Symmetry: C2
Subunit: 484 residues, 2 copies
């Protein structure tokens, strides 16, 4: 699609730049109740509310990476990847969610095998501690992230990870996509545990879409601050680094008018700022407090001190952008979802009737690589230009049982998507943004949450009817050439 001379080459990027791919434990591992592993909220959701997954599927087997992790490493090595981002399953390590319930040795051994194999192959592990898979035992006990009790259990889990793996792993991310986790698991309720306000359509409409996202977010940020403190004190040493990975939608003012520019700013605050401003300066964005008032908790003095500057790097998970269009404050508008607190509607079509960019396959990923540049300029100019990694970037191909393997392997849309994003990343780095790596989402076709297996995001095809055998797609073959 790009002309030949516009296709990125490896030396567009610094020799120390990292190219990798990313996965998460629930989406790839399978072995959901094997070797002493406890259930997560995702196990519980899929098994009890199968109707809330598009194809009524689950992650019981997924891409079977608990058993096939050696294939994963082989593929990464053959492609010449420098790094691999994966997550650790909390209830695989602590089946009851707590230290008191005991550490699952077989779970520790699995990640040790994977880390060893990566390192022996010269691939640097970037580990996500939490990727949405809360131990169901903690939900049973106290509602999981809805209660401040989560903070101690999360930090004990992270501490175990640092103890078992920290000698070998020097790059850690506490939380993946906290905004999505909060807004979509507790607001719209699409993701486990599937909670929302009465009247909102989700599996468990006995929550509160205005309050619970903020509660969960607050406990998450408190857990982040404590964990980074423990890391810095006992595990960082000379070379360790810890941060978190934020999803960020690009937001473009619906018009270049002050009302919609204001809406765009409230929208950036409500997605990026909600988590970035706490770790940058120790509190939530002003716009979030002045809007949502008492629904936004306050950090304690000691926590706050720990929160300020609690990162060595920031992960950016980038998929798409929308226009942001102003909504007036009036007796006629009452927020229903936490995201309504931004007083903005997120439009995929602009005022000239055009989509922001073309669809890539699924319901929401529109192609808009410029949005990545806009976000990186914000990071550079507004928030101090911290070290950054694009910790996820990718898109999905629809497979409703209809898609022949040869067609799925010829993933030209994804190849073009990746090339165009790498082109904009080069432009951003040339403009001074401190980006140091890029990870494709995903290494593998996997369980796409509430879409089940109907969306294939992998650069590697996973054939679930043939023992999850892996085959590189055209995108993976290009990355292989690109990496040399």
């Amino acid at each position: 699609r790009l002309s030949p001379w516009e296709i990125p080459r490896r030396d567009w990027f610094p020799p120390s730049f990292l190219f990798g791919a990313a996965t998460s434990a629930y989406q790839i591992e399978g072995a959901w109740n094997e070797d002493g592993k406890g259930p997560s909220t995702w196990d519980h959701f899929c098994h009890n509310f199968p109707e809330w997954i598009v194809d009524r599927s689950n992650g019981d087997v997924a891409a079977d990476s608990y058993h096939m992790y050696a294939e994963d490493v082989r593929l990464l090595k053959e492609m010449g990847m420098d790094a691999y981002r994966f997550s650790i399953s909390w209830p695989r390590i602590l089946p009851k969610g707590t230290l008191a319930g005991g550490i699952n040795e077989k779970r520790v051994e699995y990640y040790n095998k994977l880390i060893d194999l990566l390192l022996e192959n010269g691939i640097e592990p970037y580990i996500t501690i939490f990727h949405w898979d809360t131990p169901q035992a903690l939900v049973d006990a106290y509602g999981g992230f809805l209660d401040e009790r989560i903070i101690k259990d999360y930090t004990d889990f992270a501490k175990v990870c640092f103890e078992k793996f920290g000698k070998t792993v020097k790059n850690w991310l506490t939380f993946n996509e906290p905004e999505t986790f909060c807004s979509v698991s507790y607001g719209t309720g699409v993701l486990a545990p599937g909670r929302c306000s009465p009247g909102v359509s989700c599996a468990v409409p006995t929550g509160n879409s205005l309050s619970e996202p903020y509660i969960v977010a607050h406990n998450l940020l408190r857990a982040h601050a404590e964990t980074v403190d423990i890391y810095n004190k006992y595990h960082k040493g000379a070379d360790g680094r810890i941060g978190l990975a934020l999803n960020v939608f690009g937001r473009v003012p619906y018009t270049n008018t002050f009302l919609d520019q204001q809406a765009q700013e409230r929208s950036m605050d409500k997605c990026l700022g909600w988590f970035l401003e706490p770790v940058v300066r120790g509190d939530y964005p002003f716009s979030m407090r002045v809007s949502a008032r008492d629904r936004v908790p306050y950090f304690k003095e000691k926590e706050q001190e720990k929160l300020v500057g609690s990162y060595d790097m920031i992960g950016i998970n980038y998929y798409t952008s929308t226009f942001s269009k102003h909504i007036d404050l009036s007796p006629n508008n009452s927020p229903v979802l936490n995201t309504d607190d931004a007083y903005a509607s997120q439009e995929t079509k602009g005022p000239d009737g055009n989509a922001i960019g073309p669809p890539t396959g699924n319901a929401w990923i529109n192609m808009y690589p410029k949005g990545l540049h806009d976000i990186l300029m914000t990071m550079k100019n507004k928030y101090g230009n911290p070290p950054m990694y694009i910790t996820e970037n990718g898109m999905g191909d629809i497979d409703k049982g209809d898609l022949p393997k040869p067609v799925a392997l010829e993933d030209h849309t994804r190849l073009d998507y990746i090339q165009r994003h790498l082109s904009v990343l080069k432009q951003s780095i040339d403009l001074g943004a401190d980006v140091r790596g890029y990870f494709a989402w995903s290494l593998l076709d996997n369980f796409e949450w509430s879409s089940g297996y109907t969306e294939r995001f992998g650069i590697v095809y996973v054939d679930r009817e043939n023992g999850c055998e892996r085959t590189m797609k055209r995108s993976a073959r290009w990355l292989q050439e690109f990496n040399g």
Copy 2:
């Protein structure tokens, strides 16, 4: 103090550009109970609360312009001024504030004589309908601007002005400095009627500094919308124009940090935006509603339609600027004055310990001509670049009762102030700002509200102990030369 080659020349400005001076009725007229004139809130305030004026004075005589108006016109003509901005005293036209109480024909004749003499001399009248002098009879009846009944009475007053003077006068301003009027008469209570919350230091501490300024503002804007509708329907004809004159403090972010930039924007919204956004788009700035919530009234549908675009020109009254410094939203901060709703402290000293600019004489006007440029760029780029006039610009010399006349005449500080603001104005017009005229505040030394006669703002000296005899100061002689 500017070098000789930096002093503005008349040809820096377009041939059609207007140079004038400005006054207001209570500050210059005197004749406070003459020829059937009714009392205003300012008559009442000075007569009942002398201790709340710095020198315990009043405007009973002022500059005696009721009798000496021919001198005022002679001075304007001798200086080569193109235009004169003055105000009409509501209770001089309607002694009881209402149509029903009758029109004071001696009052009407006075303004007719002034208008006629201005026109005979080629000087264009710009008339301010209301400059803070509410008929005290309306306060007795219903609390004046605190009640929506003010709207009908104001529009009836304005209709009388249009009917009597509209054939001769083609340039009208409904209200002067609505922000100062609201914030300072009903918030800090420094100006008549001198109201503020209990615990705040003012003459009448039985008001509400959080709610009253918004009430007065809302009624004023409703009155404005109705008046412009009447003007457009019955009086505008081919050449008439109507607008309003806004005081605008320049605001500079305390640091170039997002928090203080956000604070600067809130501050601009709370001063300029409070009145400009209603007439430009039909509602108050979002930041003002999200902050002050139920204390900000909503316009009715029909009013709102009349409010949108209710101006042919905007007057800017510019004196000084401050830094704006962010205040966090927390349980530790509780607004007391309406201006606290901006969550910003206005600082005269910046982070490096330096004043924003040097004092000019009185307690608040610091020399910062660049702030005028910042404001004009905002009007150009954000609010559509409407036709604008600098309807006031000036500063005061302190006179503690002793100031030698020969010293008062040699007003080097004022001359420098005027020359420097004219130079910045030239830069702004070259950059595309649609400014069409400049009016020095003031033609005459006058009653400076709660400072009484302790501050002389005139380009013309007024000798109150010698029959209010007028003498041109150095600044006036310069203007005379400049206008040729």
